[PDB]
Amino acid sequence: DKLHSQANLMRLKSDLFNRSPMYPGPTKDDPLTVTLGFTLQDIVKADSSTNEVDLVYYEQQRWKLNSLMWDPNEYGNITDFRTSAADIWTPDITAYSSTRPVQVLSPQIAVVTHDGSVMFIPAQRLSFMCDPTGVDSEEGATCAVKFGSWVYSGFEIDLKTDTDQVDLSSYYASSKYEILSATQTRQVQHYSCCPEPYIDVNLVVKFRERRA
Amino acid sequence: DKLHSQANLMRLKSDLFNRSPMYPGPTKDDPLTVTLGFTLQDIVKADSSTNEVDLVYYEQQRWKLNSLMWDPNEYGNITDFRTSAADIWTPDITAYSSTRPVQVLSPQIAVVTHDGSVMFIPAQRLSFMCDPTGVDSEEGATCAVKFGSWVYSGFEIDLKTDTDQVDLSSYYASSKYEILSATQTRQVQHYSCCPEPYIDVNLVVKFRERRAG
Amino acid sequence: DDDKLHSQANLMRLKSDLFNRSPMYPGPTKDDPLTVTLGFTLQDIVKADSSTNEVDLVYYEQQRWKLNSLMWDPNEYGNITDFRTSAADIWTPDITAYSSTRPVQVLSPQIAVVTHDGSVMFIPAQRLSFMCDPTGVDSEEGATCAVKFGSWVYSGFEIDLKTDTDQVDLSSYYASSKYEILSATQTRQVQHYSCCPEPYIDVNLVVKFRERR
Amino acid sequence: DDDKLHSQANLMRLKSDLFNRSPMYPGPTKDDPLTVTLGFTLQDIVKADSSTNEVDLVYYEQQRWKLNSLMWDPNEYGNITDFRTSAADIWTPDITAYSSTRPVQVLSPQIAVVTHDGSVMFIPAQRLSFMCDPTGVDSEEGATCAVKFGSWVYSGFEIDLKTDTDQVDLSSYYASSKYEILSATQTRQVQHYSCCPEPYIDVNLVVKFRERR
Amino acid sequence: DDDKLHSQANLMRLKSDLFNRSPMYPGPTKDDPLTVTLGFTLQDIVKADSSTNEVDLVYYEQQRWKLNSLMWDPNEYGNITDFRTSAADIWTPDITAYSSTRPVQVLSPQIAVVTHDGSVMFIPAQRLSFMCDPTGVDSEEGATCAVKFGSWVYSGFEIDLKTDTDQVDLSSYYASSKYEILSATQTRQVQHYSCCPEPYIDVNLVVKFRERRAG
Ligand SMILES: CN1[C@@H]2CC[C@H]1C[C@@H](OC(=O)c1c[nH]c3ccccc13)C2
Ligand SMILES: CN1[C@@H]2CC[C@H]1C[C@@H](OC(=O)c1c[nH]c3ccccc13)C2
Numbered sequence A: 001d002k003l004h005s006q007a008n009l010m011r012l013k014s015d016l017f018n019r020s021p022m023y024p025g026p027t028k029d030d031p032l033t034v035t036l037g038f039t040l041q042d043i044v045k046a047d048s049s050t051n052e053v054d055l056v057y058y059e060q061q062r063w064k065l066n067s068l069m070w071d072p073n074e075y076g077n078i079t080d081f082r083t084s085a086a087d088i089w090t091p092d093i094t095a096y097s098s099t100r101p102v103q104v105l106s107p108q109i110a111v112v113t114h115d116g117s118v119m120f121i122p123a124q125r126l127s128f129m130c131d132p133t134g135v136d137s138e139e140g141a142t143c144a145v146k147f148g149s150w151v152y153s154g155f156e157i158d159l160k161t162d163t164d165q166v167d168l169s170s171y172y173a174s175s176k177y178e179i180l181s182a183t184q185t186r187q188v189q190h191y192s193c194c195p196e197p198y199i200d201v202n203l204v205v206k207f208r209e210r211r212a
Numbered sequence B: 001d002k003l004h005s006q007a008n009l010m011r012l013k014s015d016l017f018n019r020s021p022m023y024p025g026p027t028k029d030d031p032l033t034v035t036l037g038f039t040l041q042d043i044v045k046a047d048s049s050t051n052e053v054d055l056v057y058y059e060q061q062r063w064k065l066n067s068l069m070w071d072p073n074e075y076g077n078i079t080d081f082r083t084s085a086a087d088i089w090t091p092d093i094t095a096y097s098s099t100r101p102v103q104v105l106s107p108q109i110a111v112v113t114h115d116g117s118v119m120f121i122p123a124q125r126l127s128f129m130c131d132p133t134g135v136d137s138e139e140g141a142t143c144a145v146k147f148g149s150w151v152y153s154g155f156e157i158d159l160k161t162d163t164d165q166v167d168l169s170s171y172y173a174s175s176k177y178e179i180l181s182a183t184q185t186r187q188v189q190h191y192s193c194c195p196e197p198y199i200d201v202n203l204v205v206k207f208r209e210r211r212a213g
Numbered sequence C, D: 001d002d003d004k005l006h007s008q009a010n011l012m013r014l015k016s017d018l019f020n021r022s023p024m025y026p027g028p029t030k031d032d033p034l035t036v037t038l039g040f041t042l043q044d045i046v047k048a049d050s051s052t053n054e055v056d057l058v059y060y061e062q063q064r065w066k067l068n069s070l071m072w073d074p075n076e077y078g079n080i081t082d083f084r085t086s087a088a089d090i091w092t093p094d095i096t097a098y099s100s101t102r103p104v105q106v107l108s109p110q111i112a113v114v115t116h117d118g119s120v121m122f123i124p125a126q127r128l129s130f131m132c133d134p135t136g137v138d139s140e141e142g143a144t145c146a147v148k149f150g151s152w153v154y155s156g157f158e159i160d161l162k163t164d165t166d167q168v169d170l171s172s173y174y175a176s177s178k179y180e181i182l183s184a185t186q187t188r189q190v191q192h193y194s195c196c197p198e199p200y201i202d203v204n205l206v207v208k209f210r211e212r213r
Numbered sequence E: 001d002d003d004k005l006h007s008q009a010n011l012m013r014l015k016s017d018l019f020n021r022s023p024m025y026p027g028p029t030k031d032d033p034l035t036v037t038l039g040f041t042l043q044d045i046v047k048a049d050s051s052t053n054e055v056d057l058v059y060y061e062q063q064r065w066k067l068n069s070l071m072w073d074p075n076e077y078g079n080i081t082d083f084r085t086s087a088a089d090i091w092t093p094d095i096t097a098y099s100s101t102r103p104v105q106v107l108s109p110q111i112a113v114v115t116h117d118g119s120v121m122f123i124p125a126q127r128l129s130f131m132c133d134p135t136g137v138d139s140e141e142g143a144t145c146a147v148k149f150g151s152w153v154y155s156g157f158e159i160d161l162k163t164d165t166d167q168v169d170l171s172s173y174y175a176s177s178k179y180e181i182l183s184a185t186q187t188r189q190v191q192h193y194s195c196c197p198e199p200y201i202d203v204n205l206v207v208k209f210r211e212r213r214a215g
């Protein structure tokens, strides 16, 4: 009974991975749109001696590849499966103003659905460039960090959000810092280096030292 | 004789691991219950500048797979064996409010028994979100951290505990912090992101600074 | 959708032909020397530690070189003119900070852009602690420090370096840094060491900076 | 020159026969138990942190055991009596500090010595933080602490431990340490846990130390 | 174009001939012993912590040895006399600090230079924390500390060591370090241990240093 479902799932993964060579990533002729979102859990530290702030959050990443679709009826009605992020292509979404390598807090496992879509939710701790002047005031401090592909232009990787409101409903209630507001907004960057635009989602956080 | 038992173990492992492929993990039609329990060894530090607390504890993980069963009589009466956690599938049990990657303090080796049960006991150090206010009072401070699958819903991984009492019999007797109470409780919740419930075990610790008499 | 499928097979075939149908490039020799263009984009001076004389910089290191072994005719691969690939898939130059005090910490994906003429562009973002006395940083005149970059093991007969400009790119310098940049230059130098009879090449990064006020 | 060629050939053949022809030792069993000889050489107490009750030791661990599967006749292999090999080529015991607070940091190469009677010698140098209250370190009496080392997953029925002496080797203890050693002993102990019907064996390192005067 | 193509081919063939056509060198033995020439270049004393008696040093080690198994005739390979290769491609000696307090942090690419006579030059740069009491560092006489380097697992019957000079290279020492070096020596020694029937060889690096002053 369960033997058959296990066999079917193995067969599906072999047909998708071991049979077909890995996705070479997007191109101008085969571009990809990645949906990004942020769930802020904690501002751990705001360092005014170096202007770095440490955030704990997760990143919702979603995209769709035709090379990952399958007919459930042809695979025991399996409609999704979990797999190691190392078995699939994942986008190179990067903070543009980190000061330390990102520290990964969640399992590098993703969910693949029969329509070819992938959902990958990396939890992480990030130190980024942030002047916390005003954090000890009622108006608070405002910092910002952009997330995008490091190496793919908007012709290969476009980004989008499902909303411009950051999810603060999991934010730690006894953090040293309360969040006043947090937005997440698509932007188009034209850097002086590079003819091709680079797309990003800009996370803007207004925050202050917790005071009743 | 011992040469034989050694060959029997090598055979069993070859049969279990190298014959059928890796267990692809649970599915809604083949769901798995993971039994979780905690053994708290030390509250190492409570940082009020950041509201992070560092715990040293073990996490008892137990589950059972049909694909790991064998007949002991077909293998020289071997009833269990130890093996690298890399040789088997393991659940993606994750602290939901960690602030640093968890640091593993013990060997990544599991015990597999002939009924297909796996016992895995990783010791580790965790920093998590905790406001230690009141730690210097008679009432002490209270913090909590949930643990569960990151990627699997309750329809794929369920959790349970064998007791609601955290195991304190190995708690370091000269810690800077004394434990007032430690409980572990199964919870079910919905997140706005997904239509399925997710299961966690919530570790709640009440603690205060040790004082001399 | 077949056209998207075709474009993918073209890319998969090109990489297969460049990488898997030949052994990696063995690096440069006296007979086939390489020129690496180096350029720096200063993002932030994060920290200036006067107790240890170390300064920490966040910057991109632009690296560019060209190999005949990476050339292809786009017309034979459906007009594919460039592609992105893991820096592990190709040879990369061993460009090293000569006065680092800690291992460089990499902040961006290790992915390069390869073009049909055989040119490679690799732009790693990095945090570097290097040797620097920040005395004067809290004055109008400010502090001056310098760090040299070059091959560790190739002399100027095998790896030559150049810059496209002597001016460090400051267009991405963090506007609310603790430190403002008075000037930042990048200059090719040639050195002889006592060890070795051949000259080594480096690019010297000189940065003048002061506490923002 | 030719003879060195023969010697190298003989060693490569031995290693190939021991490692590539037969599978790796699956570890000890109830029917084929193993005794590991364990001893400690304490080099330094680096740090004692009274705010977290963690002490940091630098030491080496002497580990020795013997496997029939690693035996060979020297006459079959050009009179070779022993060799050095990566610890990855062989099974090693999962000897673990029961009260560490951070992952152990390895200071020496992961290479072991294998002798023709199947005995193995492995001497990992390490830095360990462990649970220790340094109260009294600033007195003439000093402070005492203890840390036990044993297998994480094998009971006394699979791995037994022994010591050649109960005296910790202090002959390489750093003479200018912040802490002088008053005593250091290593004692086999048998412990029962409520979790487990089988006892586990450990070597308990007890150190008495004080601030150098 | 065609001259460069050819030289690349010769090098590719040489490396294949050295690495794939025989298994990787099993290291030295009593019958096939090796001498490593060792030397130190000190770049910076970054930190001297008197709360724990640890000093942090950035330096590089010059390591040289020679193997018959890495020899070739340049005339057979387009007159190639040397090449650069990943240190993972070759055996390297397990030269270890005897009194480190933290793992070494590597600051240079792990690549060595191989020459047709079978000699290997490997120059690992690193930051080392080692056991060192800095008392007297705030005085004219300074502080003196020492750290030995040698093989961890091979005795003198398998790995011998030599220096080219007793004078540590201080020419590249960081001129604006918090600490000035008064002197640095590097001396071969023989150590006998109770564990083992034969002695182990080390180079003892002795450094006299003090807080930088003026005038
Ligand atoms: C997301 N991106 C990061 C920064 C901009 C965009 C693309 C990559 O940067 C570049 O290509 C260059 C930067 N500076 C340069 C100078 C000469 C050539 C290229 C670049 C990585
Ligand atoms: C234990 N889990 C963590 C958080 C909830 C549950 C499942 C995983 O989260 C998601 O799938 C999403 C979170 N936020 C989202 C937003 C849009 C789509 C998916 C998600 C990882």
Ligand SMILES: CN1[C@@H]2CC[C@H]1C[C@@H](OC(=O)c1c[nH]c3ccccc13)C2
Residues within 6 Å of the ligand: C151, C152, C153, C193, C195, C196, C200, E039, E041, E062, E121, E123
């Ligand atoms: C950029 N480089 C670093 C330092 C100089 C140049 C080449 C490499 O060093 C050497 O080969 C030697 C240094 N000191 C030595 C002493 C004896 C033999 C060789 C060397 C690495």
Ligand SMILES: CN1[C@@H]2CC[C@H]1C[C@@H](OC(=O)c1c[nH]c3ccccc13)C2
Residues within 6 Å of the ligand: B037, B039, B060, B119, B121, D151, D152, D153, D193, D195, D196, D200
């Ligand atoms: C050295 N060892 C460490 C601790 C005891 C011995 C064996 C391992 O622990 C267990 O199996 C359990 C601990 N607590 C438990 C609770 C339920 C089931 C098993 C255990 C790891």
Ligand SMILES: CN1[C@@H]2CC[C@H]1C[C@@H](OC(=O)c1c[nH]c3ccccc13)C2
Residues within 6 Å of the ligand: D039, D041, D062, D121, D123, E151, E152, E153, E193, E195, E196, E200
């Ligand atoms: C450089 N070396 C370090 C220390 C001496 C030499 C060889 C290695 O040590 C041993 O084998 C033992 C030390 N102490 C012991 C006690 C019983 C058995 C072996 C050893 C590592």
